[PDB]
Structures are given as structure tokens and as C-alpha cells.
């Protein structure tokens, strides 16, 4: 299997530089080129440029004074690190591979790193239970969640009894408060007849603050 | 740069109807198009190469066609699975160019929310905020309003909304609405209300309760 592993999501400041590192397994840097691509609400996918089997580099034209791409062929790793960053580099970071080595049919991508660019402060979320009711419990299902408030920069993600729940889960985009910092909430619907016996955890990781975050979800009384 | 133009923004269909989704390339680049498909939150995936050249793994449903500066993708029958976004890519010239995406939506029948209301946590409460959430579970079509009413009185300018992207297995959508207040002014009223209004309800729904009860 052929794949494409990124470095965790992070926060850097305006005219500073950011850095992300690709893994790549199923095939060797020395036979492949490794392409990085963007994408943003408002630019869309924007290609960054490459570095190909032999080192040799390609850097698109916006680019070319504030790109390097260097790379560790024994370990495997494509390093892509960006200059004088501004607000409109906000973006999810992509490393991808073609089909063939010259070509450029992505078949193969990263999961993508989403880097912000903006002067604040990193900042972990609190996290509190969105308990299940009883006057709320609708022809045996129950509704029940987490409210992830107040951090930054994205993302957070969040799982359910760490990933053993997923049926029902719906995690949603997160809002910009007016303090600057971001909210979302994750919930799930379960059956009414489980709210006795089956616990329901919440995992909340925020990699840019390091905060990983368990909160039990409780009936009350 | 090639400027690749994909229409329209969004493409509403019915499961099992074809569909084609159009890309147009600011000069002709012969056949040198390729197609990704991007589910929400996931990367893109190869489709199509080449205009109409077919990719280990993809269903027999998806085809693509055209030449010069018009080119097309089609998927037959389409399903719920394909429920995503879809991009082109030329690379013709230098530098490879991407189109902005057209969105895939699937019809379904009417579904009015299922609603409920989550009182501020005493956990929250200890910190001087309550914050008070109103899910709105399942629904369709998109549009939806949420009003806030406490001790009766509708509310404005405390609250913010996410809406979740279609869901690829029942086609519907889901919202939450959040109520932020301070904990002092929390506890002077008693009636917190999610008031809920959908094509699917001939009337409002409100979900309510009395703090403190």
C-alpha cells in the first residue's frame, strides 16, 4: 500500500515560516517525485511545487523566493517548509504522489495539515458534557454530546468512546467567536434503553496546545 | 495560469439519475484533464486521468469526456456514497491548475429536524459562562431557522450556528445553535426555549426547560 503520512496541525505567525514533514511507505523518494498542493476556501487547490527522484526542484511562481523542499531519502521524509508567511497562506497542506514518476495524476495524497497564519496565542479548548434529558428522549433515542469551547487556532478532533462509536456522531464545523476563539460540538444519538449501563466518552485533541481531553457524559437524576 | 471554470457551484440530483458535472479550461489543453473526488474532511481521490482514462479501484459509474476546452464528468446512477465535492485538474501548461469545485447534493424526501435542547453544564456554570445548545438532528432540506426565546422574550445578537455537511448515508443535514450568556444573567430568567421552524413542520417546534426545575 502506498502512503502518505503529514506532521500535525499547527499555528505560526505572520513573517514567519512554517514546516511540515511527509512520510511516505510503498515506495522509495529516490523512484517518485512528491508534489505539495494547497487549499483553501477562496483560493481552492493551488499547486506548491515538487521535489523530484533526483532532488532536483520545482517551484511555482508565487513561490519561488520563500519555498524549500529538501528531503531524507534513507528515512523516507519530504521536509516542505515555507517563508514570510501572511493570512492568506492559511491553508490545508498537502503532500501527494503521481501516478508515474514525471507525471502529475495525484493518486495518491496526505491527510493534509491545516497550518494557520495569524499573530494570536494558541489556546486549549474546555470541555463540557451535553447530558442526555428525559423530557428529551424522543421514541427511545437520546441525544447527547460535548461542547468544545473556546480555543485556537483549528482544528480539534473529536471521537466517541476513542472511536469504538461512530454510527450517529455528527461533529460540527466549528464557529469564530466574536473573542476570537473557536467553539464547536460533537454529538451522538443513542438508544434511550443504553442510558443506564453504557458509558459515553468524548475525546477531544487539540495538537496545536497538546490538550487531549476525555469528558464522561452523564444522565443526571 | 490555465484558468479552469467548473459549473455550476453546486449540482442537486436524484439517487440513481446520471449526472455530469462540466469543467472549461481558459485555453485548449487537448485531453490533458483529470478528476478528484473529496468527501468532507478527506482528501482528494483520483477519478479520472486524461479525460476519459479509467483508475484502479474507482466503480465503472464514473466517466469522463471532452476534448480541447470542454470536458465533462459523468457518473451513472449516482448513490449516496458520492455524495462529495468534485474538482478538475489541467496539465497542459505549467503550472498545473485546479478548478474551484462543483458540490454534489442528493434529493431525499422531506425530513423535518428532530430537536432538542441542552441546558448550560454546572461544570460551565462554575466558570461564569453558560452556554445553552439547540441540536437540530436529521433534516432536510438545508434551510432551517432556529429562534432563542427566554422568560418569552426572542433573543438576538447571543447566538451562533453550524450546520453540518450533507450526511453521506441518510442525505440529511444537522444543526446546532449555541445560546451564550453570562452565568449571572443565566440565572436571572427561567424559561430557555429553541424555538424550530422547516419545511418538514406545518408548525413550529419549541424545546424548552425551567433552569433550576
Known amino acids: 500500500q502506498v502512503q502518505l503520512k503529514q506532521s500535525g496541525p499547527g499555528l505560526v505567525q505572520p513573517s514567519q515560516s512554517l514546516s511540515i514533514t511527509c512520510t511516505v511507505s510503498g515506495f522509495s523518494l529516490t523512484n517518485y517525485g512528491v508534489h505539495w498542493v494547497r487549499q483553501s476556501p477562496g483560493k481552492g487547490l493551488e499547486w506548491l511545487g515538487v521535489?523530484?527522484?533526483?532532488?532536483?526542484?520545482d517551484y511555482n511562481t508565487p513561490f519561488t523566493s520563500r519555498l524549500s523542499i529538501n528531503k531524507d531519502n534513507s528515512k523516507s521524509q519530504v521536509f516542505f517548509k515555507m517563508n514570510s508567511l501572511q493570512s492568506n497562506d492559511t491553508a490545508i497542506y498537502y503532500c501527494?504522489?503521481?501516478?508515474?514518476?514525471?507525471?502529475?495524476?495525484?493518486?495518491?495524497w496526505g491527510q493534509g495539515t491545516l497550518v494557520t497564519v495569524s499573530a494570536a496565542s494558541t489556546k486549549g479548548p474546555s470541555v463540557f458534557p451535553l447530558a442526555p434529558s428525559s423530557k428529551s428522549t424522543s421514541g427511545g433515542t437520546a441525544a447527547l454530546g460535548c461542547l468544545v469551547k473556546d480555543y485556537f487556532p483549528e482544528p480539534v478532533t473529536v471521537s466517541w468512546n476513542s472511536g469504538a462509536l461512530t454510527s450517529g456522531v455528527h461533529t460540527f464545523p466549528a464557529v469564530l467567536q466574536s473573542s476570537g476563539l473557536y467553539s464547536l460540538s460533537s454529538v451522538v444519538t443513542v438508544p434511550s434503553s443504553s442510558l443506564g449501563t453504557q458509558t459515553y466518552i468524548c475525546n477531544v485533541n487539540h495538537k496545536p496546545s497538546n490538550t487531549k481531553v476525555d469528558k464522561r457524559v452523564e444522565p443526571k437524576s | 495560469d490555465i484558468l479552469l471554470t467548473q459549473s455550476p457551484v453546486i449540482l442537486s440530483v436524484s439517487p440513481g439519475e446520471r449526472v455530469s458535472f462540466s469543467c472549461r479550461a481558459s485555453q485548449s489543453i487537448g485531453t490533458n484533464i483529470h478528476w478528484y473526488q473529496q468527501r468532507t474532511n478527506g482528501s482528494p481521490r483520483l477519478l479520472i486521468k486524461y479525460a476519459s482514462e479509467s483508475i484502479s479501484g474507482i466503480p465503472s459509474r464514473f466517466s469522463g469526456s471532452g476534448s480541447g476546452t470542454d470536458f465533462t464528468l459523468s457518473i451513472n446512477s449516482v448513490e449516496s456514497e458520492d455524495i462529495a465535492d468534485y474538482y478538475c485538474?489541467?496539465?497542459?501548461?505549467?503550472?498545473?491548475?485546479f478548478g474551484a469545485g462543483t458540490k454534489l447534493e442528493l434529493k431525499r424526501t422531506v425530513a423535518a429536524p428532530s430537536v432538542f435542547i441542552f441546558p448550560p453544564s454546572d461544570e460551565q456554570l462554575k466558570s461564569g459562562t453558560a452556554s445553552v445548545v439547540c441540536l437540530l438532528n436529521n433534516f432536510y432540506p438545508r434551510e432551517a431557522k432556529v429562534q432563542w426565546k427566554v422568560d418569552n422574550a426572542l433573543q438576538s445578537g447571543n447566538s451562533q450556528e453550524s450546520v453540518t455537511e450533507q450526511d453521506s448515508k441518510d442525505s440529511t443535514y444537522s444543526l446546532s445553535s449555541t445560546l451564550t450568556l453570562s452565568k449571572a444573567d443565566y440565572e436571572k430568567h427561567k424559561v430557555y426555549a429553541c424555538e424550530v421552524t422547516h419545511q418538514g413542520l406545518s408548525s413550529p417546534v419549541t424545546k424548552s426547560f425551567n433552569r433550576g426545575a
Open positions: 501527494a504522489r503521481a501516478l508515474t514518476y514525471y507525471d502529475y495524476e495525484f493518486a495518491y
Open positions: 485538474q489541467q496539465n497542459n501548461n505549467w503550472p498545473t491548475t
Open positions: 521535489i523530484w527522484s533526483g532532488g532536483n526542484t
